[PDB]
Design a protein around this ligand. Structure first.
Ligand SMILES: O=C(O)CCCC[C@H]1CCSS1
Length: 293
C-alpha cells in the first residue's frame, strides 16, 4: 500500500542471488507461511526439512487471535509485533514470503496482506512459490535459522480490513463490490464447506465469484497484469470501485487483493471473518445457496 506500489512479487532468481550475496539478515528476512489442512501435508516439518537458507517459519496458527470463535483472525497489534520481532523482522526489513502449495501460492498472500494491514509495506511474495524454487534447483537447507530478535512496531491499517458489521451495512449500501475467491461449487452452494460442523456453502447475497486459482498459471506463477485485468473485466468487477474480498476464512481472499494490487489497485479490503463468521452471525436471508439452504 502507498501511491508508488512496492514490488509485491519477487522472482526466484532474485531471491537466489540475494541469498548467495549473503543478504538475508536484518534487512531481508524470508518466511515460509505454509499451512495445509490437518492430515494432508505437514507445513512445519516440510520447512524443517527444506527451506531457503536463512528463512524462518511463519506460523499462522500462532499468529492469530486465538480467543476468537472464527478462523484465522488477525492477532492484535502487540501480538503481531512480538511474533514478527522474534523472527528478526524490524520495520526496516524487506520481508519475502512463500509457501509450498502445489498451486504455487496459497497462504503467502495472506501473510503479505497481514504485514500490510499492520502497516509494513516492504513485503513481497515469491512468485512461483517454493514449488518453483525447488523446480529450478535453487539452494535449500535444514540448517536452523536463529535470527537476532528485533523490535517491530505494528499499526493496524483499518481500511484494509472489513468486519461483519461493515459487510452487513454494505448489503444495504452496496458501496463495495464483494468478490468471493472460493471455488465455484462452494460459492454456488453445490459443493460443501470443508472442515467445519454444520456450515452450509453458498454466498453472501450480491457477491461475484472469482476463484483464486484462476489468478495463477498452470506453472504456479501469477498471471500477467494484462490477463488479471481482463479477468476482473469479464467478471464485471470494476477496479476503480471499492472492493471487499471474502472467502472462507480471510485467506484466499488475499489473492484477489494481490492480483488487484498488481493491477494498480492497492486498497482491496479483506473481510477477515469471511464466510465462516458470516454464516455464524448473519440472518439466513443475507445469503443464497443453489442447493437452497
Ligand atoms: O477448495 C476446495 O474446494 C477444497 C477444500 C480445500 C480447503 C482449503 C481451500 C479453500 S478454504 S480451506
Amino acid at each position: 500500500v502507498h501511491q508508488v506500489l512496492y514490488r509485491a512479487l519477487v522472482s526466484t532468481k532474485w531471491l537466489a542471488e540475494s541469498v548467495r550475496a549473503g543478504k538475508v539478515g536484518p534487512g531481508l528476512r524470508v518466511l515460509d507461511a505454509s499451512w495445509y489442512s490437518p492430515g494432508t501435508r505437514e507445513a512445519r516439518k516440510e520447512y524443517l526439512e527444506r527451506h531457503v537458507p536463512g528463512a524462518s517459519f511463519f506460523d499462522i496458527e500462532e499468529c492469530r487471535d486465538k480467543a476468537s470463535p472464527y478462523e484465522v483472525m488477525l492477532p492484535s497489534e502487540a501480538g503481531f509485533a512480538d511474533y514478527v520481532g522474534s523472527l528478526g523482522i524490524s520495520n526496516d526489513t524487506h520481508v519475502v514470503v512463500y509457501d509450498g502449495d502445489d498451486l504455487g501460492s496459497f497462504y503467502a498472500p495472506r501473510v503479505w496482506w497481514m504485514f500490510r494491514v499492520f502497516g509494513h509495506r516492504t513485503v513481497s511474495v515469491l512468485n512461483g512459490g517454493f514449488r518453483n524454487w525447488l523446480k529450478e534447483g535453487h539452494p535449500v537447507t535444514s540448517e536452523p535459522s536463529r535470527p537476532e530478535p528485533a523490535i517491530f512496531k505494528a499499526t493496524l491499517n483499518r481500511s484494509l480490513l472489513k468486519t461483519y458489521e461493515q459487510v452487513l451495512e454494505n448489503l444495504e449500501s452496496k458501496r463495495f463490490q464483494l468478490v468471493d475467491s472460493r471455488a465455484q461449487g462452494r460459492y454456488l452452494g453445490t459443493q460443501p464447506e470443508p472442515d467445519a460442523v454444520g456450515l452450509d456453502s453458498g454466498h453472501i447475497r450480491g457477491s461475484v465469484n472469482m476463484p483464486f486459482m484462476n489468478f495463477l498459471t498452470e506453472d504456479g506463477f501469477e498471471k500477467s497484469p494484462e490477463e488479471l485485468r481482463a479477468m476482473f473485466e469479464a467478471k464485471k468487477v470494476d477496479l476503480t470501485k471499492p472492493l471487499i474480498a471474502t472467502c472462507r476464512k480471510g485467506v484466499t481472499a488475499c489473492h484477489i487483493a494481490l492480483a488487484a494490487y498488481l493491477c494498480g489497485k492497492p486498497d482491496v479490503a479483506i473481510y477477515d471473518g469471511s464466510w465462516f463468521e458470516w454464516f455464524h452471525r448473519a440472518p439466513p436471508e443475507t445469503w443464497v445457496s443453489q442447493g437452497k439452504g
